[PDB]
Design a protein around this ligand. Structure first.
Ligand SMILES: [Ca+2]
Ligand SMILES: [Ca+2]
Lengths: 304, 290
């Protein structure tokens, strides 16, 4: 019951409330007023349905924390250390990171080139805030990281997209690890939950499909991180995939497994294993006809 | 269903299947209707060989379909394939090639091209001859695939250019407006046409090259619409400088002043020199879907 309420917060509350529900730390350094922070685990939890918040760390309840080294909260090399020395995520960074996670690469490319000085895809700090603001409506350590110690430098699209890919990778890796993989593999059902969560769909029927996934793969070899990451790289490319499928749309044809692999390798530049595609079809082929209509998969992912 | 429209323009029939000649195909792309009903000639397997032998003499460039005229055959599958190509930016050609080259040997073979027909189903034709020879002897490499698709787009633009210029060397601004609005039958069309008649100066007429540049820009509408939406979200009116930078970002290139001026005279609907860009985009989408 708790998990369902939490899922409504994720799907319908404001970012303010989501952050106050899932963030677990309130750090004080008096006279400095306290500030609430997510750990990377909290951030991943806030975007992962059916993951319970620690029972005494619900709404507005936090774990209290007061030259000297400060406690750190992210693994070696994590993207979250771009935000500061501890890997903690303030509210404003939470807004920014969720925008970066979900924005198509092309929209950032266009935005950088439309709002900068010369159209090269190189913004300064005020232009980058225009881009963020616009990208948001469409749907300090880091400002120094992007624009230099003096805040006078500019941010190229090439560097910012490396940031975006690193961020997407580290978050997907952390989500993968939070399903506690056995020998580097998570279960078909766990992968299925990641696909539903990503789609943002609120459907009892799709939820029924996902829990059924255990029965379908009695076999149970699970999915490696490379299999999962390749499919999410395919999803990130869904608009260009859909365009590449133009002939199939004209024919009224649905998407079968061999076509999904061909367009994935052609457009997203990844190989999708037979097993990952079987899991995807078993999840979203609701009418059970063995192929995916535009309504059953592509449209869901595009309109997410 | 584009199948009704295919059979309406098809002038050929064989064993229950309808076929276009290259002439038929060109007309179905430029026009919504016939203007005259087309007579359907039944083909034996002997009419077909006769109609296919001779692809020797047509031009391997941008006059391939116009040179063939009625001397060829195009199946429903191939009609849909050619239509998808006409909408693609140049960057989509290699994607289309690689989608068909399923064994990855960088050549399309007749057997791989036949996958399109199998999609439609779930005999010899002009394209199969041009690409693979009569027994599928030949294999199609990317550079002759790319050149054929570039030349297909070029051929439609050259044919439409002369169709709407009525044979003159240059397109008048209102001839370009007639082309642009040819597939537009929406509730605001009287306002567009009033602007054409009253605000289109007899200024600098449009060259074929300037027309071709606009047609290439219409294949980058996805990025152009994203740029238009970002200006709208920024509450920035789309004046000529905004339009120019969205064109350059979507495109890499410029449009000529006579064409920019024509677009703004037609779609500046408020009189403040801002473009009604949603209505413009609508007409552009009318064009692309033909
Ligand atoms: Ca289905
Ligand atoms: Ca091949």
């Amino acid at each position: 019951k708790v998990m369902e309420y939490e899922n409504r917060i994720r799907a319908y509350s404001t970012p303010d409330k989501i952050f106050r529900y899932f963030a677990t730390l309130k750090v004080i350094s008096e006279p400095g007023e306290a500030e609430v922070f997510m750990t990377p685990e909290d951030f991943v939890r806030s975007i992962t349905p059916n993951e319970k918040q620690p029972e005494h760390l619900g709404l507005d309840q936090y774990i209290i924390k007061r030259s000297q080294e400060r406690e750190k909260f992210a693994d070696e090399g994590s993207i979250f250390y771009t935000l500061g020395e501890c890997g903690l995520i303030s509210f404003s960074d939470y807004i920014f990171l969720t925008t970066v996670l979900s924005t198509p690469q092309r929209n950032f490319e266009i935005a950088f080139k439309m709002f900068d000085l010369n159209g090269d895809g190189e913004v300064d700090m005020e232009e980058f805030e225009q881009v963020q603001s616009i990208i948001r409506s469409q749907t300090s350590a880091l400002t120094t990281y992007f624009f230099g110690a003096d805040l006078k430098g500019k941010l190229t699209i090439k560097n910012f997209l490396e940031f975006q890919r690193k961020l997407q990778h580290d978050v997907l890796k952390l989500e993968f690890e939070r399903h506690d993989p056995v020998d580097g593999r998570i279960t078909e059902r766990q992968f299925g939950g990641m696909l539903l969560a990503y789609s943002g769909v609120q459907s009892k029927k799709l939820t029924a499909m996902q829990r059924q996934l255990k029965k379908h793969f009695k076999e149970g070899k699970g999915l490696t991180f490379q299999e999962v990451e390749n499919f999410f790289t395919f999803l990130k490319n869904i608009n260009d995939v859909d365009t590449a499928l133009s002939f199939y749309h004209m024919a009224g044809a649905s998407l079968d497994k061999v076509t999904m692999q061909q367009v994935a390798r052609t457009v997203a530049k990844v190989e999708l294993s037979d097993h990952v595609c079987d899991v995807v079809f078993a999840l979203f082929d609701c009418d059970g006809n063995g192929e995916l209509s535009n309504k059953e998969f592509v449209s869901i992912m595009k309109q997410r | 269903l584009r199948k009704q429209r295919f059979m309406q323009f098809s002038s050929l029939e064989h064993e229950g299947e309808y076929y276009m000649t290259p002439r038929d195909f060109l007309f179905s792309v430029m026009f919504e209707q016939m203007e005259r009903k087309t007579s359907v000639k039944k083909l034996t397997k002997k009419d077909i060989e006769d109609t296919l032998s001779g692809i020797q003499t047509a031009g391997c460039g941008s006059t391939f379909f116009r040179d063939l005229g009625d001397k060829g055959l195009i199946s429903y599958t191939e009609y849909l394939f050619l239509l998808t190509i006409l909408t693609k930016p140049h960057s989509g050609f290699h994607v289309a090639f690689k989608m068909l080259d399923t064994d990855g040997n960088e050549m399309i073979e007749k057997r791989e091209f036949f996958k399109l027909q199998k999609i439609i189903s779930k005999i010899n034709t002009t394209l199969q001859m041009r690409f693979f020879g009569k027994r599928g002897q030949r294999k199609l490499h990317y550079k002759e695939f790319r050149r054929f698709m570039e030349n297909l787009q070029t051929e439609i633009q050259e044919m439409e250019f002369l169709q709407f210029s009525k044979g003159l060397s240059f397109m008048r601004k209102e001839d370009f407006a007639e082309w642009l609005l040819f597939f537009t039958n929406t509730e605001n069309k009287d306002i567009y046409w009033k602007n054409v008649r009253e605000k289109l100066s007899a200024g600098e007429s449009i060259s074929l090259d300037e027309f071709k540049s606009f047609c290439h820009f219409t294949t980058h509408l996805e990025d152009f619409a994203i740029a238009m939406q970002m200006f709208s979200l920024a509450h920035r009116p789309v004046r000529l400088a905004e339009f120019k930078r969205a064109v350059k970002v979507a495109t890499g290139q410029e449009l000529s002043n006579n064409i920019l001026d024509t677009v703004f005279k037609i779609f500046d609907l408020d009189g403040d020199e801002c473009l009604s860009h949603e209505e413009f985009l609508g007409v552009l989408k009318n064009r692309m879907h033909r």
